[PDB]
């Protein structure tokens, strides 16, 4: 709940208001994971927030 972050595996460009654009290697907090395919995430690396494809991240663990 504050102990885990995820790492971006690939670059992703959002053209939607609510998606997050990110680069591979960013450190992300998962905010909402109620759905399996799209998660609300916050990038600690950029300070930006938005939905991400869950297949584009893996736990940093
Ligand atoms: Ni935690």
Numbering used by the authors: 81 to 141
What does the paper say about this structure?
The c-Src tyrosine kinase is made up of six functional regions: (i) a N-terminal fatty acid-acylation domain, (ii) a unique domain, (iii) a Src homology 3 (SH3) domain, (iv) a Src homology 2 (SH2) domain, (v) a catalytic domain, and (vi) a C-terminal regulatory domain. Of all those, the SH3 domain plays a key role in the regulation of the tyrosine kinase activity through the recognition of an intramolecular Proline Rich Motif (PRM) and, additionally, through the interaction with other PRMs present in other proteins. To better understand the mechanism of 3D-domain swapping formation in c-Src-SH3 domain, and its plausible implication in amyloid fibril formation, we have solved the crystallographic structures of the WT and three mutants at position 128 of the c-Src-SH3 domain.
For comparison of the two monomeric crystal structures superposition of chains A of the WTM and Q128EM structures were carried out, resulting in a RMSD value of only 0.15 Å. In both monomeric structures, the side-chain of residue Glu106 in chain A (Glu106A) is hydrogen-bonded to Ser123A side-chain and two water molecules, thereafter W1 and W2. However, in chain B, Glu106B side-chain is hydrogen-bonded to Thr125B side-chain (2.8 Å) instead of Ser123B side-chain (distance between Glu106B and Ser123B is 5 Å). W1 and W2 molecules linked to Glu106B side-chain are also maintained, but not W3: the latter is present in the WT structure, but not in the mutated one. In the Fyn-SH3 domain, and in the c-Src-SH3 Gln128Glu mutant, the presence of two negatively charged glutamate residues in the folding nucleation site would result in the electrostatic repulsion among the residues buried in the hydrophobic pocket. This repulsion might favour the intermediate-like structure in chain B, where the glutamate side chain is oriented outside the pocket formed by the distal loop. Remarkably, the mutation of glutamine by glutamic acid results in a change of the pH where amyloid fibril formation occurs: Gln128Glu mutant develops amyloid fibrils at neutral pH but not a mild acid pHs.
